[PDB]
Amino acid sequence: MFFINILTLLVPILIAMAFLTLVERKILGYMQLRKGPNIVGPYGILQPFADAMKLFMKEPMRPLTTSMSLFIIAPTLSLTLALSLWVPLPMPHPLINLNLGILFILATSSLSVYSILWSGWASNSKYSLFGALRAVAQTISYEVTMAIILLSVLLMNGSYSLQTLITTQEHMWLLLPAWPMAMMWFISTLAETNRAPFDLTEGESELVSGFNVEYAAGPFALFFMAEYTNIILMNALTTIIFLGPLYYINLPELYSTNFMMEALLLSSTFLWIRASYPRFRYDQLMHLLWKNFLPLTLALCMWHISLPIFTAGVPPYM
Amino acid sequence: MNPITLAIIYFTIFLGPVITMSSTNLMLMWVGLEFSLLAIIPMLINKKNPRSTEAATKYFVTQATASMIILLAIVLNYKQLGTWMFQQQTNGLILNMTLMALSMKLGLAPFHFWLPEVTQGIPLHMGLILLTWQKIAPLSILIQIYPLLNSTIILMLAITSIFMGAWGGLNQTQMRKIMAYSSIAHMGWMLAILPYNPSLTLLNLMIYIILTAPMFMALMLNNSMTINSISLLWNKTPAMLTMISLMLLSLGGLPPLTGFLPKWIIITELMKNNCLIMATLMAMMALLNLFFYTRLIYSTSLTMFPTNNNSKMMTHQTKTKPNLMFSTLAIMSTMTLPLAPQLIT
Amino acid sequence: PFLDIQKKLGISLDRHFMFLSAEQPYKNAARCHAFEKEWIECAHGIGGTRAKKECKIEFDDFEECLLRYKTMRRMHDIKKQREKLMKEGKYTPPPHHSGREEPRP
Amino acid sequence: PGIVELPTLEELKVEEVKVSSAVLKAAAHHYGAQCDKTNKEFMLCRWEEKDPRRCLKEGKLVNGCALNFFRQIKSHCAEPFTEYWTCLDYSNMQLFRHCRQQQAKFDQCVLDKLGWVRPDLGQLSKVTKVKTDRPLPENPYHSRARPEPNPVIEGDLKPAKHGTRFFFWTV
Amino acid sequence: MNLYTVIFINILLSLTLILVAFWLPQMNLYSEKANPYECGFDPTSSARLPFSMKFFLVAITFLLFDLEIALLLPLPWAIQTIKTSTMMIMAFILVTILSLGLAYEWTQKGLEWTE
Amino acid sequence: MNNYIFVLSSLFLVGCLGLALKPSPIYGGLGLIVSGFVGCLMVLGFGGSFLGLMVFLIYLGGMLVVFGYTTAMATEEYPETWGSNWLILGFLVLGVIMEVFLICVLNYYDEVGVINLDGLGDWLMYEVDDVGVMLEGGIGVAAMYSCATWMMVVAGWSLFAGIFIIIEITRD
Amino acid sequence: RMMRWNQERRRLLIEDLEARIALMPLFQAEKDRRTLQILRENLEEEAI
Amino acid sequence: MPSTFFNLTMAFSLSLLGTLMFRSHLMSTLLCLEGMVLSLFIMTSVTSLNSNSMSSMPIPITILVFAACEAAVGLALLVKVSNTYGTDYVQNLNLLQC
Amino acid sequence: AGRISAFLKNAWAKEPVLVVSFSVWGLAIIMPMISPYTKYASMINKATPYNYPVPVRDDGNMPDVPSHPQDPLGPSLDWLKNL
Numbered sequence A: 001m002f003f004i005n006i007l008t009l010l011v012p013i014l015i016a017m018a019f020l021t022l023v024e025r026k027i028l029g030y031m032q033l034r035k036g037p038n039i040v041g042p043y044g045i046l047q048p049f050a051d052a053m054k055l056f057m058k059e060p061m062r063p064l065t066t067s068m069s070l071f072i073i074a075p076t077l078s079l080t081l082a083l084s085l086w087v088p089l090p091m092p093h094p095l096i097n098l099n100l101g102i103l104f105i106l107a108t109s110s111l112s113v114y115s116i117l118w119s120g121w122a123s124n125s126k127y128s129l130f131g132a133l134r135a136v137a138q139t140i141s142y143e144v145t146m147a148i149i150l151l152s153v154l155l156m157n158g159s160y161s162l163q164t165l166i167t168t169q170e171h172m173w174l175l176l177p178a179w180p181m182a183m184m185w186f187i188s189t190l191a192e193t194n195r196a197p198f199d200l201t202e203g204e205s206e207l208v209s210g211f212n213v214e215y216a217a218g219p220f221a222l223f224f225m226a227e228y229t230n231i232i233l234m235n236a237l238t239t240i241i242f243l244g245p246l247y248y249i250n251l252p253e254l255y256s257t258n259f260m261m262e263a264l265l266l267s268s269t270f271l272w273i274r275a276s277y278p279r280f281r282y283d284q285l286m287h288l289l290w291k292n293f294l295p296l297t298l299a300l301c302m303w304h305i306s307l308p309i310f311t312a313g314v315p316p317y318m
Numbered sequence B: 001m002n003p004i005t006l007a008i009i010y011f012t013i014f015l016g017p018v019i020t021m022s023s024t025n026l027m028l029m030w031v032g033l034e035f036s037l038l039a040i041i042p043m044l045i046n047k048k049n050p051r052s053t054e055a056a057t058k059y060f061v062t063q064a065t066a067s068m069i070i071l072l073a074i075v076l077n078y079k080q081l082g083t084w085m086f087q088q089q090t091n092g093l094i095l096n097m098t099l100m101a102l103s104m105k106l107g108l109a110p111f112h113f114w115l116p117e118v119t120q121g122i123p124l125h126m127g128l129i130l131l132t133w134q135k136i137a138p139l140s141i142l143i144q145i146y147p148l149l150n151s152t153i154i155l156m157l158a159i160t161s162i163f164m165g166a167w168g169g170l171n172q173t174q175m176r177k178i179m180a181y182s183s184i185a186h187m188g189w190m191l192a193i194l195p196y197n198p199s200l201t202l203l204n205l206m207i208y209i210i211l212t213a214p215m216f217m218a219l220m221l222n223n224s225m226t227i228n229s230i231s232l233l234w235n236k237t238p239a240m241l242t243m244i245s246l247m248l249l250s251l252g253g254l255p256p257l258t259g260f261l262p263k264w265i266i267i268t269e270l271m272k273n274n275c276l277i278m279a280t281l282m283a284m285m286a287l288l289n290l291f292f293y294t295r296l297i298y299s300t301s302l303t304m305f306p307t308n309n310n311s312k313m314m315t316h317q318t319k320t321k322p323n324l325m326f327s328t329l330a331i332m333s334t335m336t337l338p339l340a341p342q343l344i345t
Numbered sequence C: 001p002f003l004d005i006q007k008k009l010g011i012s013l014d015r016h017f018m019f020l021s022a023e024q025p026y027k028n029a030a031r032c033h034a035f036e037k038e039w040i041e042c043a044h045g046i047g048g049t050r051a052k053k054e055c056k057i058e059f060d061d062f063e064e065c066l067l068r069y070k071t072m073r074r075m076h077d078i079k080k081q082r083e084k085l086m087k088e089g090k091y092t093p094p095p096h097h098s099g100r101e102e103p104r105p
Numbered sequence D: 001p002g003i004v005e006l007p008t009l010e011e012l013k014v015e016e017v018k019v020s021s022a023v024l025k026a027a028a029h030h031y032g033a034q035c036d037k038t039n040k041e042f043m044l045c046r047w048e049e050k051d052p053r054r055c056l057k058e059g060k061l062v063n064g065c066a067l068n069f070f071r072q073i074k075s076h077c078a079e080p081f082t083e084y085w086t087c088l089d090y091s092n093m094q095l096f097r098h099c100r101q102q103q104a105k106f107d108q109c110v111l112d113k114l115g116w117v118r119p120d121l122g123q124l125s126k127v128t129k130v131k132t133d134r135p136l137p138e139n140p141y142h143s144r145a146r147p148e149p150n151p152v153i154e155g156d157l158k159p160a161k162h163g164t165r166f167f168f169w170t171v
Numbered sequence E: 001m002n003l004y005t006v007i008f009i010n011i012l013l014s015l016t017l018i019l020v021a022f023w024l025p026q027m028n029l030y031s032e033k034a035n036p037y038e039c040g041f042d043p044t045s046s047a048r049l050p051f052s053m054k055f056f057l058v059a060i061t062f063l064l065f066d067l068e069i070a071l072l073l074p075l076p077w078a079i080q081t082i083k084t085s086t087m088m089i090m091a092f093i094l095v096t097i098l099s100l101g102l103a104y105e106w107t108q109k110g111l112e113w114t115e
Numbered sequence F: 001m002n003n004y005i006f007v008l009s010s011l012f013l014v015g016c017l018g019l020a021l022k023p024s025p026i027y028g029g030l031g032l033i034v035s036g037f038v039g040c041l042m043v044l045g046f047g048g049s050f051l052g053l054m055v056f057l058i059y060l061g062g063m064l065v066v067f068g069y070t071t072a073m074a075t076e077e078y079p080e081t082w083g084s085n086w087l088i089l090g091f092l093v094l095g096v097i098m099e100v101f102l103i104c105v106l107n108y109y110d111e112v113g114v115i116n117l118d119g120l121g122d123w124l125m126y127e128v129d130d131v132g133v134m135l136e137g138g139i140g141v142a143a144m145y146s147c148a149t150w151m152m153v154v155a156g157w158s159l160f161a162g163i164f165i166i167i168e169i170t171r172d
Numbered sequence G: 001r002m003m004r005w006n007q008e009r010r011r012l013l014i015e016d017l018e019a020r021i022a023l024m025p026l027f028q029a030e031k032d033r034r035t036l037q038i039l040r041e042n043l044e045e046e047a048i
Numbered sequence H: 001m002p003s004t005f006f007n008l009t010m011a012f013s014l015s016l017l018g019t020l021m022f023r024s025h026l027m028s029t030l031l032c033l034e035g036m037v038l039s040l041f042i043m044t045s046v047t048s049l050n051s052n053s054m055s056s057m058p059i060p061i062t063i064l065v066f067a068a069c070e071a072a073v074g075l076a077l078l079v080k081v082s083n084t085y086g087t088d089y090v091q092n093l094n095l096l097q098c
Numbered sequence I: 001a002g003r004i005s006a007f008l009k010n011a012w013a014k015e016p017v018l019v020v021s022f023s024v025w026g027l028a029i030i031m032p033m034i035s036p037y038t039k040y041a042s043m044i045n046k047a048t049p050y051n052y053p054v055p056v057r058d059d060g061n062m063p064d065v066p067s068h069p070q071d072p073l074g075p076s077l078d079w080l081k082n083l
C-alpha cells in the first residue's frame, strides 16, 4: 500500500511535468502573439508525449572525448533528486514525514548542482565547461541568501518541519509578515532552478547550450524532466511556505485543491517571467545577490531574531 | 596592509596562544593552535614572491597535518573517557601521538626539516615571531601533561634535536637557517627536561627567547642574511659588535653567561634522575653549537672582512635603530648569571 | 590550565562542560552520569597519583559503563553457548524469545 | 562480582491499564488531579531511590488508582467520554484543539456527576510536596568512603635556611 | 525504511530510462559524429586546460559565509532557552560581524571579479 | 538491518581509501561527497539528525568551490581516474582485500573487543529516554547561544578573522 | 497576528505537555515492570 | 559502536597516509586534509550521541568551523602557488633548499 | 547636522537597499530595549514544562509549596492565559 502511494506521487508529478512543457510553449506563444502547439492532439495535448517518444528513439551520443561514468551518472542524478524533493512535501500530509524537512530540501537541492557540474566537466567540451563554471558561479550567488531567508521565515514557524508550516499559517499567510523575504525568496528560486532571467548555465544565446550541449536523445531528456520538475516543486514549496493553503482537518481535499491552484499560478509566473525580461550577466547575478539581497537578508535575520522576543511571540517547539 | 588588517591579524596571533594557555578543555586548546596557524600565514607571505609563497605553503601543510593528528588524540581520548582532558588513565598510544604531533609543530627533529626552510623564505621579523612566540602554545600544552609523557619518546626526540641542530647549523652560511637550527637544538634541551622538571623547560625557553630576540633585532638593524653580510658590521654598526659577540657566546652556553645556566641546570636535574648517558651526549654535542657560533664571531667582531666602497655613503647617514628593548634584552641575556638562584626557583 | 586566568577571574569560559556528568540542556543526564559523578568525587583533593590507585574501583566501574567491554563479552558468551546447544539439539528458546510473547501492558 | 537481584515474574504482576494513548490523553487532565497523591509518591520513590526494584509497591498503587479512576468514568460518563477520545484519536498528533466541543461535554459530565474540576493551565506542572512515611535513603549511590585528604602542614613561614642553597651562592 | 524505498524507486526509474535510451535507438557510430562540438570547426585545444576563475576570492568567501550559516541554523532551537538575553546578544553579534566582514570585503574591491 | 551501520562505515572507509590514492581532484571531490553522504547516514543511524545534515550541507558547498578551483588550477590534460593507472588500481583493489582480511583476522583473535561480527547490531544504541521530548541534536548544538557561548565567540572570530586573512593572502 | 497566534500556540503546548506529565507516573510504573520482567526472563534462560 | 570506531579510525589513518604521501597536485593533498576532518567529525558526533552528552555537540560544529578556515586558507595559498608557476605541482616548491 | 540630511536624502535616493539594511539592523537592537513585552519571552519559555516536576519530600517546614496541584499556591500562569 506504500508502493501504490509512490505511484500516486511519481506518476502524477511526471505527467504534470510534461504538460508544464506544453503550458510553457503555449503561454509563451500567446504572450508572443502566436498560438504555440495545437496540432499534435487537441490543442497540442499530445505534443509532450511526441517529444518524449522522439527523444528516446533518437540515437544517444557517446563523444570520444567524454568521461562516460560521470557523463551517464549526471543525468541520472538530476532526475533522481528532482523526484526525491517531492516525498517530504505536505499536501497536506507528506509521503515521508521528516523533522528537518527544510534541510532535506536545502541539502537535496544543493546536491543537484553536481549534475550540472559533472555533466559539463565530463563532456570535455569548451561550451560545456563554460556552462559548468556558471553553475558554480550561480550557486555561490544564491546559496548564502537562500538558506538565511529560510532561517528568517522559520523563526516564526518554530522548527524545520514542513508540516508545521500548515499550522503556522492557519489564520494568515506568512506572505504578510514576511513579504520582503518572499520577494527575495522568489528570486532565489529562479536562480536555483536556472530559470530566465537566470538561465546562465544553459544560456543558448552565449553558450550554444551550456552544460548539456553534448547531450542528445534520452539522456538529454532526463535533464529536462529534472528542470521542469524542479519548477513545480520550488513553486509548490513557495506555496506551502508563504501562501499557506486552507487546511481543515475534516477536509484534506480542500487543502490539496487550494494548494494546486496557487502552485499552478506561481508556476505560470515563471513562464510569464521568461517571456518578459532579458537575461542577466552571470557576474551581475552575483552582484545582485551579494550586494542587494544579502545585506537585506542579514538585517531581516536580525529583525526576525528580535521580533519574537519583543512581542513574546516565540513559536512553540512542537 | 591597512591598520584594520594589522589590528585583526596581530590580535589573532596574540590571541591564539592565550586561548591555548588559559583553556581547561582540549578542544579550546586545539582552537588556539588553529588561530596561530591561520593568522601567521598572511604575515609570512606578505612580501609575496616565489620564496615566501613556498615558505607559507610548506608551513601550512605541515602545521595543518599536525593539527589533525592532535585533534585525533583529543577525540580518541573523549571516546575512551568521555572527557575533554588527558587523564592518568588515558591510553598510552593516545599520548604518544600527541607528542609526535606537537613536536612536528615545534620543529623538533626528526620532524624538523620544514623549520629551517620556512625560516629562510620569510622576513626577519616574522622569523623572530615564528622562532619565539609561536613556540609557547605547543609547549604550554606539553607542560600541562608532563606526568603522562613517555620519557623514552621525549629523550629520543631531544637527543635527535640536539644532534641535528648541531650538525645542521654547522653547514650554514645563511643567518636565518643558523637561527632555525639554533632553535631546533634548544628545543631539544627544553624537551629533554620536560617530563622531569617542567619549570626548567620554562627557564630554558625564556632565556632562549631573550637571546633569540635581540639576535634577530641585530640582524634586522642592517637586514643582513648571510655571513658575509654580517661581516660588514664593523664598517656599518661597530657599536653592535660588543653585544653580538656576547649574545652568540651566550647562545652557546659558555660560562659565565646567562646561557650556561639553562644547560647546566638541565644537566644537573637530569642526573638527579640518573639520566647520565643522555645528559652526557647532550652536553657533548652542545659543544658543536659553540663552534659555528664561534665561526660567526670570527667573521664579525674578532676580524675585519673586506668592505666595499658604497658603504661610505651608509656612514654619512643616521640610523634610528635599535630601540630601547635591544639593549635591555642584550644585558639581561648575558650578564645575569649571578642571579641564577632567583631564576630557577 | 597553564595560566589559570578563568579560575583567577572566577569566570568559566570552558570549565563547565569538561566531562559527562556536567550540566546538560533540559536536565538530561548523560550515559554513565552516576558512575562518573562517583569517580570525580572519589579523586577530588587527593591528587592524580593517589587517585590512580585509591579510586581504581570507581574508575574501573565508570570505564565499564562507558565502554561496556565486559557486558558485550558476557552477552557474547551466553549467545555463543546457546548457539552450540541449539545446533546439537538440546535447547529450544522459550516462546517469549522467539517472537510470540503476551506483550505488556 | 555480585549477583544482580531481580524480582520473580509473579512479583511483577498487576492489573494493567490497557487503554490506548488517546484514551489516556483525553482523561489525562482529570486523572492528574485525582490520582495525584498516589502518583506523587511513586515519583518521589523513584527519584529518591534511583532503583526500580525498590518501588514495586508504590508503582502497583499507581495502577490501582489509574484503574479506579477509569472505573468511575465507566459508570457515570461512558458516552460523553467515548465521543471525546474517539475524536481525539483522529488527529495525527492527537491535539486537544480539534475536540474542544466534545471535550466540553465530557467536562460537563464529570463536573456535575462526579464533582471533578479540570486543573487550570499551569497547575499540573507545579512542584508539590508529598508526605510519606518511607525512610529517606542516606547512601542512594552505594558509594564507598571518600579517600582521606593529604594532611595539611601547619606552621608559619620562616626564611629558607641559609638562603637558596644553590651551589656556591651564599645568600 | 520508506525513505529508503522511495529513493531506490527513484533511482531505478532513472536507471531504467537510461537503459532504454541506449539500447532502444538504432546507433551508427563513426569518428566524425563523435568528435566534440565547437560551432562547426575543429577544437584548437583540449577542454581540460586551465580555466581562469575571475571570482575566486568570492568562492572562498562563500566557504567562510557557508559555515556561518551552520552557526545560525540552530537558532530555532535556541529561542527556546530561558537565557533569552544571552541567546539574543550572541545572535546579534554573530550576524553583525558577518555583516562587518562583508562590508570590509565589499569596500576592498573583494566582491569585484579580477580582470 | 543488523549489518546496516557496519556497511555504512565500510563504505565510508573505501571513500577515504579512494580519496587517499588521490586521482584528479575532480574525483577526489566526488569521494568526499559520497563519504560526506555516507557519513551523514551514520550520524543519522546513531540517532543524530541536525549533525548529520549539517556535515552533508557544509561539504556540499566546499566541493562546489573545490570544483571551481580544480578546473582553474589543478587540472592537467589527462586527469587521472582510479582505473587510469595500473599501480593505483592495484592498491585500490588490494586495499579492499586488506580490510576483508583485517576485519576477519582481528575478529578471530578477540571476537568481541574490536570487531564483533558475531554481534553486529546488538550494540548500536545503548540508552535512550523512551518518554523524552527534548533530545534532538539541535538542542545540544543550540547550547552555543546560552551555555557554551565561548564556543561561538571563538567560532565567530575564526570566521571573522578569516575574511581579513584571505583578502590579504590573495591580494595582488 | 503572528504574535497573538504564537502566544496561543504556547498555551496549547503547555496543555499538551501537562497531559504528558499527568501520565508519566503510569508510564514510569509500567516501564519498570516491563523492564524488570525482560531482565528476569533472560536470567531464567541463562540458568538453563 | 565498536565496529564503527574501528572503521572510522582506519578511515582517518588512510587519509593521514594520503596526506603524508604526496603526488603531483597540491589540491589533492588538500582534499585529504578534508578526509581527516570528516572522519574526526563523524567520530565526535557518534561519541557524543552514544553517550548522550548533549553539551559536547557544540564541539563537532566548531571542528567544521575551524576546518573551513583551513580549507579557505589552503585554497588561498593554492592560488598564489598557481600564479607563480602556472600549476599547483608540489615539485615546483623547492627553491628554499638554498 | 545639516550636511547629514543631504547625505541621507542622497543615499535614500540612490542606495535604498543599504539605507533599509542599516535601519532594520538598528531597529532590531532598539525594539527589545523599549518593548514592554520583552520580559515575557523568558517567562513563557520557563513556563513550558518539558521535564517532570519531581516532587520534594514534605519535611514539615514547607508552608509555600502546594500539596495538591489544584492548591491556591505555587507558580501560576494566569498572566499567560490573559496575555
Ligand SMILES: CCCCCCCCCCCCO[C@@H]1O[C@H](CO)[C@@H](O[C@H]2O[C@H](CO)[C@@H](O)[C@H](O)[C@H]2O)[C@H](O)[C@H]1O
Pocket: B002, B003, B004, B006, B007, E107, E108
Ligand atoms: C595598528 C593597530 C592600531 C590601530 C587600531 C585599529 C583602529 C584603526 C583606526 C584607523 C583606521 C584607518 O583605517 C582606514 O581603513 C580603511 C578601510 O577600513 C581604509 O580605506 C580603504 O577603504 C576605503 C573604502 O571606502 C577606500 O577609500 C579604499 O579602498 C581604502 O582607502 C582607510 O584608508 C584607512 O584610513
Ligand SMILES: CCCCCCCCCCCCO[C@@H]1O[C@H](CO)[C@@H](O[C@H]2O[C@H](CO)[C@@H](O)[C@H](O)[C@H]2O)[C@H](O)[C@H]1O
Pocket: B010, B011, B014, B123, B125, B220, B223
Ligand atoms: C594585543 C595585540 C598585540 C599586538 C602585538 C604587536 C607586535 C608588534 C609588531 C611589530 C610589527 C612591525 O614590524 C615590522 O617591522 C618591519 C621592519 O623590521 C617591517 O618590515 C619591512 O621589512 C623590509 C625592511 O625592513 C621592507 O622592505 C618591508 O617592506 C617592510 O615590511 C614591517 O612592515 C613591520 O610590520
Ligand SMILES: CCCCCCCCCCCCO[C@@H]1O[C@H](CO)[C@@H](O[C@H]2O[C@H](CO)[C@@H](O)[C@H](O)[C@H]2O)[C@H](O)[C@H]1O
Pocket: A309, E084, E085, E086, E088, E089, E092, E093, E096, E097, I029, I032, I033, I038, I039, I040, I041, I042, I043
Ligand atoms: C560587536 C557587535 C555588537 C553589535 C550587536 C550588539 C547587539 C546588542 C543587543 C542589545 C540588546 C539586548 O536587549 C536586551 O534584551 C533583553 C532580553 O532580550 C532584555 O531583558 C529583559 O528580558 C529578559 C528576558 O527576555 C528578562 O529576563 C530580563 O529581566 C529583562 O531585562 C533587555 O531589557 C534588553 O536590553
Ligand SMILES: CCCCCCCCCCCCO[C@@H]1O[C@H](CO)[C@@H](O[C@H]2O[C@H](CO)[C@@H](O)[C@H](O)[C@H]2O)[C@H](O)[C@H]1O
Pocket: C083, F002, F003, F006, F007, F010, F011, F014, F117, F118, F119, F120, F121
Ligand atoms: C562497500 C562494501 C561493503 C561490504 C561490507 C560487508 C557486508 C557484509 C557484512 C559482513 C559482516 C558480518 O556479517 C555477518 O554478521 C553476522 C552477525 O552480524 C555474523 O554472525 C551471524 O552468524 C553467527 C554464526 O557465525 C551467529 O552468531 C548469528 O547467526 C550471527 O551473529 C555472520 O557470520 C556474518 O555473515
Ligand SMILES: CCCCCCCCCCCCO[C@@H]1O[C@H](CO)[C@@H](O[C@H]2O[C@H](CO)[C@@H](O)[C@H](O)[C@H]2O)[C@H](O)[C@H]1O
Pocket: B015, C011, C012, C013, C016, C023, F146, F147, F148, F149, F150, F153
Ligand atoms: C581578550 C580576548 C577575549 C575577549 C573576548 C571574550 C570575552 C568573553 C565572552 C564570552 C563570555 C562567556 O561567559 C561565560 O559564560 C558562561 C556560560 O556561557 C558562564 O558560565 C556559566 O555556565 C553555566 C551556565 O549554564 C553554569 O552552569 C555555570 O556555573 C556558569 O558559570 C560564565 O559565567 C560566563 O563568564
Ligand SMILES: CCCCCCCCCCCCO[C@@H]1O[C@H](CO)[C@@H](O[C@H]2O[C@H](CO)[C@@H](O)[C@H](O)[C@H]2O)[C@H](O)[C@H]1O
Pocket: F017, F020, F021, F022, F085, F087, F091, F094, F095, F098, H014, H017, H018, H021, H022, H023, H024
Ligand atoms: C596496502 C593496501 C592498503 C591501502 C593502501 C593505500 C593507502 C593509501 C596510500 C595513499 C598514498 C599513495 O602512495 C603513493 O606513493 C607513491 C609511491 O609509492 C607516490 O606516487 C608517486 O610515485 C608513483 C610510483 O611511480 C607514481 O605512480 C605516482 O604518480 C607518483 O606520484 C605518492 O607519494 C603516493 O601517491
